[PDB]
Write a protein that binds this DNA or RNA. Structure first.
Ligand SMILES: [Mg+2]
Ligand SMILES: [Mg+2]
Ligand SMILES: [Mg+2]
Ligand SMILES: [Mg+2]
Ligand SMILES: [Mg+2]
Ligand SMILES: [Mg+2]
Ligand SMILES: [Mg+2]
Ligand SMILES: [Mg+2]
Ligand SMILES: [Mg+2]
Ligand SMILES: [Mg+2]
Ligand SMILES: [Mg+2]
Ligand SMILES: [Mg+2]
Ligand SMILES: [Mg+2]
Lengths: 136, 177, 77, 50, 116, 66
RNA sequence: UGCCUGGCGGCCGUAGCGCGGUGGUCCCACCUGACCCCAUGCCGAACUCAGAAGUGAAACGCCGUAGCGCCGAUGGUAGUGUGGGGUCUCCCCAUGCGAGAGUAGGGAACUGCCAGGCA
RNA sequence: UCCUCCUAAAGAGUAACGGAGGAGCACGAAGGUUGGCUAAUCCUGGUCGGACAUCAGGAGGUUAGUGCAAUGGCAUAAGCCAGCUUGACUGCGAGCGUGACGGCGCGAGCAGGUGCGAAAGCAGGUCAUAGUGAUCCGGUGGUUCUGAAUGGAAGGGCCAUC
RNA sequence: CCGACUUACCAACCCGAUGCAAACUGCGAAUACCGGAGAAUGUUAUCACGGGAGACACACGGCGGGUGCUAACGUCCGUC
């Protein structure tokens, strides 16, 4: 489960989520799974979609995860009234904007890559798409 | 002393022909000698550093400069300002007077002398040498002294390379291998 | 949870008389903490680095200096 | 804290004193500073007192 | 560097004399010569200059670049600037310790009518 | 020099048993007599005379008197 | 008027670092000596005094070279004031302002006041 | 109760039982001035010596340092040494800043007497921002200002201070 | 002893590529704010002093946010 070690501060503002993403092209591999939606995507869904990918190919190629949560999310306990401090951090999410390339892998035929990414796209809340490398 | 004009009359001509120098004073020359010994254990007791200082002043006729810790390090339990060791630098005449009597009596008195290594240059043309024994100099009578603290000889020449630095020291009959 | 809830009164810093303003003598030009604006021609410097006028005139901000530091001066216009 | 209050009473004979603080644990001896006495309008010595 | 360390050693006094808006008498010293010149409060243009390299001064001097030479140039600077109406200047060390030829350069200029 | 904070530094006559009479400036207070100096120190000819420790086969062969 | 050099500024990397070449009549720099004027928490190494033998090696100045540093458009993108709109935890339309990064490229400064030497 | 940063939407200000840390001091030098100096961390070479002491060269550049938390600052150093010293002084103060007020803060310059420096000059505490509480009541010292018929005095007032 | 040979290990500093930050900044808007000048317009709309008050329980909506679950006709701020 991806999670930063030795963070500067325990709790972090909610903030907002606007604009398009920066890493919008495949730079390490040749096939990439690119988001089209928006929303925080926790560290539990990152691992659940990685397992569904290293199992579809199961022997070949390298896999790059181009996202990292580094955003603490705090949840208030149950039967607790509002106020009296901030909640205790529970999980970590990686804020995703459209265009962000989440996963990408090289070393497998395109047909196997296309189907493997489909098995991971069913474990992520956001609407993803398949993208291939270009030249620029 | 005599080594100075020996350098002027012989070493300059020896090195001018060897290295094909165009100007007279482009040949390297030694500019200072630095003598020290960090007693280190003077952290516990003060009278050792005063004893080491008396030794350095006897070896070279100058009062040593006591040096203090540059930064506090917990490895040896020292802190800023703690006197750790002495230091003496010799220039001009007193440099040659100590230098002449280093190469002629002190080094030959080394117990089981085998030769000073010629690969001790710091990569620019300066020579550094330990002695491990402060009794080889005649200014120690073996009876006043108690410890076997060693010195640290440094030959600071204006040579641009150790290849030239080796030649300059060799021209002074330095006991290399 | 709790162990927080402390702060201090705001010190009301910042530039008081901006560039092009006609000031009197001794009028405070900028209250600062470090030395963000350096004293130039005809302005002084307090013990808390407050910059004050020394002759009546028009304020001027300039970036003279080898290190490109902001300077404040006064033109006796 | 450990720093207590003293007064430097003038030596010009007039009654004038500058009041300051001084740590006694490190230094138990008196204080001697040449200061200004407005009563006589001269710089005179101020020995510590109280 | 031996000159750069001196330049930053004389910056504080040199910038205060400009903020003060006062005429200054900068003094440059060389192992073989000594120079002096009176620079306007602007700092960019000079009013009066006299130095040992001047042939009108060096020919009467046994060896330019000693205390007796620094006394002669100081007199020259003061008399040259006396007919120009400059009387109130401020001495500038330029980083040299006010101890040797610069002291004689100032002292002879001070005695020759200049007030600083 | 800083005017009498240093030990006395004078000229002495240092000589060897094999000559090597070389005048030097030092701080001892009295002339000193020592061994062969760098001129006559056997650091350049006794090398074979220095590495000679050992010898067992020939020593036994001496004892082979039969 | 021209060239070389020193002092004081303006200006602040298009102005600095690196690599190579070059300069000693004057200037500058290293340099000789140290009782003295002064100094080293030891050392004339630095500071300082007394001079001129040697040198342009080091430093400094000048010239050349883009390997870095640095400056950097046009077009587009993000953002955003006002007025409207949507399937309104985010966007779109009309209009005004319009980056940052990157690309093409520019680029090893320019200049003012005195004082020497030469032609 | 006070100090530093964020929330605070590029002037000032701005809330929550919002997110993070500090103070109730210290210094007669750790203040003033004059003179001088520049770090961390690395490489190489070097007796004990070692990943790491002290030393000699080179790279680097302030990534060090600041009595004390954080921010802003600092090479002309506000950082680091030494000499002499008490401006950590008295009466004032043009003109501003910030508070509903009580108040708090900055301040050129004038008068009298000092300190450092050759001099120009700098000095009315400390790199700046925390280190603190009004009035009443009473204590100590100075000062004819008053002194319930008059001369004194007790007691008040003013100045310094607890 | 010198470490003499090995490892299927991990691995700091630097080099190239890729992201994140309210308490990061070698860059940096739009608006807002302060000052000056100018025409038009506005039954002085501005400031000072003085007589009289009320009020100090706010609510929703848009935009920028803290908290909450980017839940609440929830709660606390800025601006309209
Ligand atoms: Mg603000
Ligand atoms: Mg605002
Ligand atoms: Mg409000
Ligand atoms: Mg201090
Ligand atoms: Mg100073
Ligand atoms: Mg100070
Ligand atoms: Mg402080
Ligand atoms: Mg009476
Ligand atoms: Mg009374
Ligand atoms: Mg109320
Ligand atoms: Mg209310
Ligand atoms: Mg409200
Ligand atoms: Mg409500």
């Amino acid at each position: 489960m991806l999670q930063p070690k030795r963070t500067k501060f325990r709790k972090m503002h909610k903030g907002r989520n606007r604009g398009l993403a920066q890493g919008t092209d495949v730079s390490f591999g040749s096939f990439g799974l690119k988001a089209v939606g928006r929303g925080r995507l926790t560290a539990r869904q990152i691992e659940a979609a990685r397992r569904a990918m290293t199992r579809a190919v199961k022997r070949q190629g390298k896999i790059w995860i181009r996202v990292f949560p580094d955003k603490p999310i705090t949840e208030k306990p149950l039967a607790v009234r509002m106020g009296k401090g901030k909640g205790n951090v529970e999980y970590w999410v990686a804020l995703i904007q459209p265009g962000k390339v989440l996963y990408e892998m090289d070393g497998v035929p395109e047909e196997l890559a296309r189907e493997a990414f489909k098995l991971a796209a069913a474990k992520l809340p956001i609407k993803t798409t398949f993208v291939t490398k270009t030249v620029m | 002393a005599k080594l100075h004009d020996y350098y002027k009359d012989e070493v300059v001509k020896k090195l001018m022909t060897e290295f094909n120098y165009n100007s007279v004073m482009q040949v390297p020359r030694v500019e200072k000698i630095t003598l020290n010994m960090g007693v280190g254990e003077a952290i516990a007791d003060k009278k050792l550093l005063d004893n080491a200082a008396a030794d350095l002043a006897a070896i070279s006729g100058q009062k040593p400069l006591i040096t203090k810790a540059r930064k506090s390090v917990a490895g040896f339990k020292i802190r800023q300002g703690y006197p750790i060791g002495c230091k003496v630098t010799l220039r001009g005449e007193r440099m040659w007077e100590f230098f002449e009597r280093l190469i002629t009596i002190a080094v030959p008195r080394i117990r089981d002398f085998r030769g000073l290594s010629a690969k001790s240059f710091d990569g620019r043309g300066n020579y550094s040498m330990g002695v491990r024994e402060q009794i080889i100099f005649p200014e120690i009578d073996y009876d006043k002294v108690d410890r076997v603290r060693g010195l640290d000889i440094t030959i600071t020449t204006t040579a641009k390379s150790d290849e030239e630095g080796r030649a300059l020291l060799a021209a002074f009959d330095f006991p290399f291998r | 949870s709790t162990r927080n809830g402390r702060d201090s009164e705001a010190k009301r810093l910042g530039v008081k008389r901006f560039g092009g303003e006609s000031v009197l003598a001794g009028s405070i030009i900028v209250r600062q903490r470090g030395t963000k604006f350096h004293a130039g021609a005809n302005v002084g410097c307090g013990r808390d680095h407050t910059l004050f006028a020394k002759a009546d005139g028009k304020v001027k901000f300039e970036v003279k200096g080898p290190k490109n530091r902001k300077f404040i001066s006064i033109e006796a216009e | 804290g450990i720093r207590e209050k003293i007064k430097l009473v003038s030596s010009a004979g007039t009654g004038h004193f500058y009041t300051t603080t001084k740590n006694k644990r490190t230094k138990p001896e008196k204080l001697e500073l040449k200061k200004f006495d407005p009563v006589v309008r001269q710089h005179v010595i101020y020995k510590e007192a109280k | 560097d031996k000159k750069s360390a001196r330049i930053r050693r004389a910056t504080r006094a040199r910038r205060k004399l400009q903020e003060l808006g006062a005429t200054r008498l900068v003094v440059h010293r060389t192992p073989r010569h000594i120079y002096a010149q009176v620079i306007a409060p602007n700092g960019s243009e000079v009013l009066v200059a006299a130095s040992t390299v001047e042939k009108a001064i060096a020919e009467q001097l046994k060896y330019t670049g000693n205390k007796d030479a620094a006394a002669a140039v100081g007199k020259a600077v003061a008399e040259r600037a006396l007919e120009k109406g400059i009387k109130d200047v401020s001495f500038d060390r330029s980083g040299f310790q006010y101890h040797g030829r610069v002291q004689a350069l100032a002292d002879a200029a001070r005695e020759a009518g200049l007030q600083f | 020099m800083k005017k009498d904070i240093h030990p006395k530094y004078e000229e002495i006559t240092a000589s060897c048993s094999c000559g090597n009479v070389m005048k030097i400036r030092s701080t001892v207070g009295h002339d000193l007599n020592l061994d062969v100096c760098s001129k006559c120190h056997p650091f350049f000819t006794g090398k074979q005379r220095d590495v000679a420790t050992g010898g067992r086969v020939d020593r036994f062969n001496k004892r082979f008197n039969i």
